[PDB]
């Protein structure tokens, strides 16, 4: 048996959102559901459970009168439904069966997780700026270039270097959620340094959610 | 959490580990203790239930106990594969709900330390010519995969404007993050330099750049 989730969401402050939980292959209404949730960095947090064989639900105190969890009998789905939701609310949010039908039995089968954000952002492609080194280039010696993909929404977005044929020292970094509701994130390649003079550096940006595709050419200046 | 666990734990190959689990009479002194075993990016998985009993398909080198108002798990023979975050879990009474512990990263050291390699940039003078300023800071392949970051303009402690992601697995099993700094064109101009610092296994590793 599995338990699968319904996609990632993207939510404005103060909305509502509902997450999906099938289980596939054969009934689940005879166990409990619980729903989990994890902040990005932090641990496992109860939301609260449902149990319809006895027709009954459970809630964490802290999220009382703002989760709704139902099941849906008849298509054997379980649902979330969070509502008023703030940026603390951003997380991955869990469906996991019970293996009886109590919220004390460990949950053996869990879903693969529901991405929530909540950001007052709408669809932006980034600005892309080149990073360059100026006593990185030493002595030498390898240098590192990068490109800073600033302010896009919502995830995600593609890096690649010199229209793929460099692959060698690149690292493209996963992006940072800034208090702003848009992303940020850096790619690096790694050249040497002597390859600076004789090789041009181009980093190709593409973001599908904006048709935004945008080449920058990196390269130490003054 | 009304449960608690140890934040970070260490182990190596071969050895024997156990991470605890800390609760009270109305959950672990009455209820049966659960844990659950979780790797970066993907959801968890049950290790142990009833306080010592495994799903078929988890080693037996797995293994729980409950005593009193608290639970250990028990590692032995620790592979490098075992390296993940683990809960404990319980029902609780008086709550009338389920309740985990914070969680123990647990470091299977059969790699060396690695110190973090850390790569800062000033602002591009694109940014700076469009009125903005951003400082970035990368950093990469280092191991256990927990640092912290602290940014100084000059010798002082800026605290605002800084943006720092949570750390993440590489290809070659270490770990990265960055930290970004944002400021004014004019912040950055009054100041002769600007540093990152970041401290790993306590020890720092700093990089600075200036306005020159």
């Known amino acids: 048996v599995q338990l699968v989730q319904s996609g990632a969401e993207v939510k404005k402050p103060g909305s509502s959102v509902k997450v999906s939980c099938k289980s596939s292959?054969?009934?689940?209404?005879?166990?409990?559901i619980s729903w989990v949730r994890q902040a990005p960095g932090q641990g496992l947090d109860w939301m609260g459970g449902?149990?319809?064989?006895?027709?009954?639900?459970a809630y964490a105190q802290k999220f009382q009168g703002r989760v709704t969890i139902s099941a849906d009998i008849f298509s054997n789905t379980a649902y979330m439904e969070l509502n008023s939701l703030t940026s603390e609310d951003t997380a991955v949010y869990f469906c996991a069966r019970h293996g009886n039908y109590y919220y004390y039995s460990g949950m053996d089968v869990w879903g693969q997780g529901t991405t929530v954000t909540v950001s007052s952002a709408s669809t932006k492609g980034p600005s892309v700026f080149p990073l360059a080194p100026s006593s990185k280039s030493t002595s030498g010696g390898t240098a590192a270039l990068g490109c800073l993909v600033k302010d896009y929404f919502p995830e995600p977005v593609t890096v690649s270097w010199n229209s793929g044929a460099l692959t060698s020292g690149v690292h493209t970094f996963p992006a940072v959620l800034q208090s702003s509701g848009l992303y940020s994130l850096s790619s690096v390649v790694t050249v040497p340094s002597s390859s600076l003079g004789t090789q041009t550096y181009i980093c190709n940006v593409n973001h599908k959610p904006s048709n935004t595709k945008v080449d920058k050419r990196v390269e130490p200046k003054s | 959490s009304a449960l608690t666990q140890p934040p970070a734990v260490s182990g190596t190959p071969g050895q024997r580990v156990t991470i605890s689990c800390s609760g009270s009479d109305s959950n672990i002194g009455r209820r049966s203790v659960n844990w659950y075993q979780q790797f970066p990016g993907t959801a968890p998985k049950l290790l142990i239930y009833?306080?010592?009993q495994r799903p078929s398909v988890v080693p037996d080198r797995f293994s729980g106990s409950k005593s009193g108002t608290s639970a250990s798990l028990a590692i032995s023979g620790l592979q490098s594969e075992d390296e993940a975050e683990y809960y404990c879990?319980?029902?609780?009474?008086?709550?009338?709900?389920?309740?985990f512990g914070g969680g123990t990263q647990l470091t299977v050291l059969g790699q060396p330390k690695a110190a973090p390699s850390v790569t800062l940039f000033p602002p591009s003078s694109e940014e700076l010519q469009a009125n903005k300023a951003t400082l970035v800071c990368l950093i990469s392949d280092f191991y256990p995969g927990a640092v912290t970051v602290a940014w100084k303009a000059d010798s002082s402690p800026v605290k605002a404007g800084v943006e720092t992601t949570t750390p993440s697995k590489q290809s070659n099993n270490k770990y990265a993050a960055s930290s970004y700094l944002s400021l004014t064109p004019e912040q950055w101009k009054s100041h002769r330099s600007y540093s990152c610092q970041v401290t790993h296994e306590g020890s720092t590793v700093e990089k600075t750049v200036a306005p020159t």
């Open positions: 449902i149990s319809p064989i006895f027709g009954s639900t």
């Open positions: 292959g054969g009934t689940s209404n005879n166990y409990a």
């Open positions: 879990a319980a029902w609780d009474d008086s709550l009338k709900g389920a309740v």
């Open positions: 009833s306080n010592d």
